[model samples]
Target chain A: HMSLENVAFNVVNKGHFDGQQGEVPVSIINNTVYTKVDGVDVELFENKTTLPVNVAFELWAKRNIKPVPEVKILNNLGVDIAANTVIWDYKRDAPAHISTIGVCSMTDIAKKPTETICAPLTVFFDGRVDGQVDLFRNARNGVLITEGSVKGLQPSVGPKQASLNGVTLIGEAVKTQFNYYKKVDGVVQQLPETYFTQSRNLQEFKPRSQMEIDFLELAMDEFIERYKLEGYAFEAIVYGDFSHSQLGGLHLLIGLAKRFKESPFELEDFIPMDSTVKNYFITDAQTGSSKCVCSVIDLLLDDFVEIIKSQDLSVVSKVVKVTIDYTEISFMLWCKDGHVETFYPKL
Target chain B: HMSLENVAFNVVNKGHFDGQQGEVPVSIINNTVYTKVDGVDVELFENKTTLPVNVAFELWAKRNIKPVPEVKILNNLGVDIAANTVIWDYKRDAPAHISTIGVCSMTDIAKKPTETICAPLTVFFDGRVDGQVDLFRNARNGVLITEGSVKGLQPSVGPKQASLNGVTLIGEAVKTQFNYYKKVDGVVQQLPETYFTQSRNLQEFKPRSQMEIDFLELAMDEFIERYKLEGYAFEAIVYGDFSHSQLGGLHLLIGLAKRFKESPFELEDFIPMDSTVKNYFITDAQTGSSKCVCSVIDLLLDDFVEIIKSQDLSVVSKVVKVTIDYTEISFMLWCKDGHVETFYPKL
Candidate 1:
């Protein structure tokens, strides 16, 4: 269901991983969960009481192939417990008197490589507007990629990975979902599926001027005429080589609209401009004739640049490009040869 | 150097022509004693006892081909007065103390047709930035049309034409001077002339898309590179048929920039979008096509539409077009095989 190369599971204390490194194999024996660290088998959880550890582990494993619909479990003491039905369900599936675990993803889990895992690690899901997200227990999260990355780096969560020693690592993960839960009876439930379409609007991203006008014109008309949209207010995000720092810098129109009747005279004045979320121009890219495919999801401007700069540009062949599927509210990035990264906008 | 058909002098109370109607032929009988209501030569002042009427009449006469630099005289009591050196001049020499009248044509001026000439009728001159103008005690005024035209309508001290119930008007009056009076030690003086070349930028107005990209590119480069403009923060004004009332619209890109790095999403959100001060548009002569010149001077959108609708479609030949010359900051409008109108932008 999912590529093993891109699937990772790490033991984190706070937000950081605190165990062994590399692709640690996960498995369960009897009621105990164990993973290999430095070629040695290490016990993660004893699973010795009536805490429903097997059920939770099964649900977490299913995240690689499908969404975990519900999850409920009790502490080792068994005095207090939570159920999947009330966590984030839109329906009041849980009892009014009892608290439940909100809907979360075992498949979509991300943990810092240097933090130790504690009992009942918290989880989060995407929020709708402004790309906000749900945070349960001690999970730190948000809608925008920058928000999540910044949360991951926050010292308030835990000490930095550089300050920690002997932490294990795992495989990279594919981005599969944006929104994770729907609010229900003051709690959130895991969603059966995403509201937006999974596919992308364009096959590949291209420069603004090089793009076919008919498609853009049609898309614009559909957005305005069909959906009755007024105009775009915020700067459209740009991804790929355009944001690559080593390639020289980030540069884009930032704003896109049919008619500017309602747009501001200068958009940067309203939104913050930074490597993570704003415009920058590199001297080398400035000399080269190029354009950007504005707006891609799940990639922070900073991380995107770092990722591109880390790769060998000569062997890469085609640089990264992005496409915005307005109908699905999706921002997708794709390479000409073959590769894809997609995300859903919260607006 | 000017024509009589374009010039008109109406007797105005204050700014309103409150007196009689009909063409009144004005003349000086021994430099005094004007005429009556209906061809009846009535004695107005007879060089008049204590009134310095002669001095006021003389200043009004100089308005034909040249601006009267100064004029000073007393009223009924003969207590106060002004001279060409003191009235509108910054200094004694017309060139030194005064800025000559600027570019103005008589056909552009519209008048109410009645009102008797009064003592010390105030006059006004154009000011540079924002196209503002200075108002002397007695110049007449109103709305619509061009601000330059309204300045032309102002009534200074002039002789009453009672004999013909009308007056013979002339031209050659310079439109060069606009008040730049800065008081230095109890006396006003004119600053050195502006560095900007005072001239129309284009031969005629043309459509935006029809324009050469190089010209626009060059202009943009010049505007940004030469002038060191950071970015656009306001809507540029467009003049001519685009503002014609009969045509039924005022349209423009509103914001023009190279990279749009600093261009606003909606200019009106920041700057005012008034017809006189901002961008406008009109119907095109080309079938099924449309174009707007963008920037024009003082002209109401409603009236501009009306004027366009009033014209014939076929014989009128070309409809609306615009031309922009970046160097002079001038926007010109023309209808091929017909009429034309232009206004300077106050950058």
Candidate 2:
């Protein structure tokens, strides 16, 4: 007594026309093994050693009025036993952990213009956690959908959850298994610690010493002579907490490139007044705490503007922001060879 | 004119009865020192060295019809000039970054039964970013609430925004400054990376060999004999992947403590069928891939149960779960002297 539900075979099919289906199906007649497939049955030993079930089921289903399970191949006594165990079996005797295959009429394009086959390949999931598994409605020329979420069982946070909450769990496998990733807040993120003292946290006010200032001023004079920026053709500003004549400790200063475009020059053009876009450049904070921080910034800004002007005037029209803290100076620059680069100079 | 609006003095008060408040007030006459307070004016050089503005303003406000600022100490000509520059000035003349003090009549309990002072101390915020300062109606007998958020200026993400968006800024400073911390999803979070491999990802099946099994069984027997539970009374089951006599490779075994708790026991009592709570112990997965993992588990679980029974039986009833994975075994334990502990045994 072969039951339709007992029809079980473990198969793998990653949604394709030609793929691994299941075990071979063989037919025996007159003590000789025969083959079945493609609208006909033939002797199994005639040529091929194994007959694929894919073609056999196709021919069997089309000609039979009854379901394949009820179409008997048995002629033995007691409860209509099958002629052999290979062709048919009762539902109670089926093996565990298996998927069932089903057939349907479909006009499939194959190997080019293609030929239509009566059975379009499909698989039905039939597996259980521990007990006997029940057969589900097989999918044919269609899809099967599953939705759920994964969760961490033990938690150190709440009594239970750092609960990543509910999420879509399958036919798009988050590791094609039962509950692997626990979705939290329906968001993706992360977690850790060195905390290399953020620059802002290091904003303690420290000014350059007098001895350092005198030498730096002379050093700045040297760079100016080298660059010839003691004012020949470019516009620059001498803005700082102190006057240009004011030298020595606690002198804050800054100078940057600017374009006298359709709009008049304003503080916004010199400082990052608009939070989103970096507009210009400024020295350190009102807190002037660095070894000739003022001179370093003033000359570097002047040098950068000169580099930009010589490289590309188009870049000058765009927003170029630069900042030089005592620690490091990072900024974007354009090259004469045609490329933009951000230099993170560790000073 | 000492207009009420111009009233400002740099002060510090962490909302208390007596704290650092603004500038000190002084009264001048015959170029002599004087103190003022408590509905009376007294000589400053008589008994007290200095007069606190807290007491001076209290006395000045009670007996005066006009505001304290208008109570003139001026007699000089041209424009109304104060006897000295100490008493009054225009709002534009107030020092920068200073808070203003205000007074209100209130009954306050102090040293004991307390005294009711007409001038209860309070401060007002009148600071501006970069222009003429504006003073909002300040907090008097109640609270002042300010709400906003902090944000990172330069972001490496998006065209903008790593946008930890809008959040309450003050009336509780996330560092009292101009936008320091950006709020995200109206949520608090964290970020970084170390990604230690999760134990589950290493679920590839590995099994133990026969050579290790016999030695481990002998080891387990030694531990069993030492614990003296070769069987005096504890209940245990020989449930595993193989028959109890099947000693060799790929055999799984587990033993743990359990109570008879009135109801007949089921498989759920031996297996952790419940996902959230670890109710019982199972020797790893069906994959028997640990050197004496079964023996180690069986002996350890027996040892743990002995520990629990000796220390406290209440903990046993209160759901004590144990897990022994290959990496490390972590479990909660209660001490005999009255304290809870977790043991992390590295295997």
Candidate 3:
């Protein structure tokens, strides 16, 4: 049943503020410590604290190519802090489904942070009663609410304060609801993002950024192009190295692997180096089927910038390690006498 | 009281195999699916498997620059699979610590897989009560155990066969105890990695790679060179971008951020893009104190390979952006022809 223009791609046009009414209370305080009491926005601590109670909400996106909307917390809104009195709270009636500890990168009407999209939020503090938590939508301004504490929510010592009232933040340009799966006759099921119609070309030709290398190369190219439009044929690995320090000089480990089943790639993102070779992938959560068990995608990033410009620097350090595998169209180099090159970039 | 040479920085010398003892019963069976019963090793799943039962232990670091040994499971040794009646057992005592779900990447004897060291474990199913769950250690070719199913274990179908009878694996090359704090007189104390004595220059000069850009640029340069040898002064940020897929052609996003206090950096690594202005850091888990909120960084990589060799592939395909601000050493570029560039990388 997924239609609202296929989950509204990046919704929020509201007639581009149509005839323009009264909402622009825009506030900006510089020292930036925030405190609001009663209407609630608390954040003042000296002792006990856990972490994460952030509220940045700026979002403009009048269009550089849509899809930046989706942000939430509106269910009865939230916040009240004292410490020892709470362990985890979304309160109001809690549990409409809480699971999103963090991540939100909205900034793309192409003003330029590039459409930085990060999705993961279940929160439902329930709204309307209006204590206040409007994360953003008609949020002409109010609801900046920035409280604090989240490593097991313990905050309170000597003076204590973190109250964030009936939170509200509903931006929704649509596109929320994902846990996709499909395999019909052979069974695997659980689908719907319009049963993955090539993820509507990433809900509108995606590629906005805040840049952790294009946010993990466009979320590993939409998690391997919706598992290769259902036929599944994936390959992508980029592991880099550098860990040298005479008195604190270098630390650069890189990681990103998409080898089907296991190893969704995490060793805090790569750092086990000797000669590097270890692989395995066997996923069949009952037929979502994903097998690539041993040795694959040998490893690339121009073969690690060709073994770090031929065996870690110092041939005169003219420095060179170009890479543009543009998905294996190749273009690798690693020079400075240590030599190493590959071509194909004239397209 | 933690000194066995800082837990022998990546321990595993076993007297450097002194006498080359005869423990090479060596076993190899490629189809690579295991199921040993009497001597105990059962993995015959039909129920609901999530797979990742790997055992490839062959380590030795007489010095290629240390740190590679760390693995565990030795409480009661594991596995007894099935949906019921259980088959072969070992519940003997169970649960002493049991935290290890899995992940170990050692390969530093330089047998190439190149200094691979990934850690975290604590599993004990208790072995030698003679039931068998030895996850490889005096494993003289006879043990390569490796099992699977993680994410809250439950893999049962009809007849059931998931037994993992009493497992045992513990290879702690020392160096596991971190909560790290330091304020002393003002009282925040929890120190000890030898109280951060410049991490004793990383316990013993270090570099063992499984490469993730040299394991996070050497663990963010030993988490910012022991916070600048205790005097504190740190900075490093690298964010890159790429995304031009008319129909799935280019997608790259890079990210790494380290800003004191917090923004340890993770959007799977970079994509918050905009005119880019975000700054927040309020770390205070009991007085470790940190407060900085609102905006920051500068940008690099041969100035994003000179704007992808000057403007991403010609005639109006438009769209390109780059950044590098190694603490303001500077370099920024943006294009589509509305061109914008900044420089400084002559060093």
- For A1-347, candidate 3 gives per-residue lDDT tens digits of 21212111111112111222223212123212222222112222111112222222111111111111112111111211110011122222121112221222221122111122211221222122142233222122111222332132222211011212111111121112211111222232222111001110111122222332332455545644533321111222232111221111001122323222223332221211111122333232322334332222222233333334334422332333232211112222223444322211211
List model 1 lDDT by residue over B162-273, tens digit each: 1011111122332333222322222333233222111111222222332323323455445335433222111122211212213222222211222122311112111111
Listed models, DockQ each:
0.00, 0.00, 0.01
**Model 3: lDDT to the true structure:** 0.22
The alpha-carbon deviation from the true structure for residue B238 of candidate 3, after best TM-score superposition, in angstroms, is 6.4
lDDT of 3 by residue, B168-187 (tens): 11224422221111121122
TM-score of chain B of each: 0.22, 0.17, 0.20
- Per-prediction fnat values? 0.00, 0.00, 0.00
DockQ of 2: 0.00
- Give one digit per residue, the lDDT tens place, for model 2 in B1-347: 23111121111011111223344344443322333222122232211212333333322222111111111101110111111012212221111112122332221222111122211322211122211011112112111112222132221111100000111111110112221111122222221111111111011211133322332344445544555544322222222222233222221122221111111222223331111112322233233222332221323233344444553533422333433211123333433234333221222
For DockQ, the strongest prediction is: 3
Candidate 1 off by > 4 Å: A1-181, A195-347, B1-187, B192-256, B260-268, B273-347
* CA lDDT of each prediction against the hidden true structure: 0.25, 0.23, 0.22
User: Which ten contiguous residues of candidate 1 chain A have the minimum total lDDT?
Assistant: A159-168
Between prediction 1 and prediction 2, which has the larger lDDT?
Answer: 1
Query: Residue A282 CA error for candidate 2 (Å)?
Result: 51
**Position A232, candidate 2: lDDT:** 24
True contacts kept of 3: 0.00
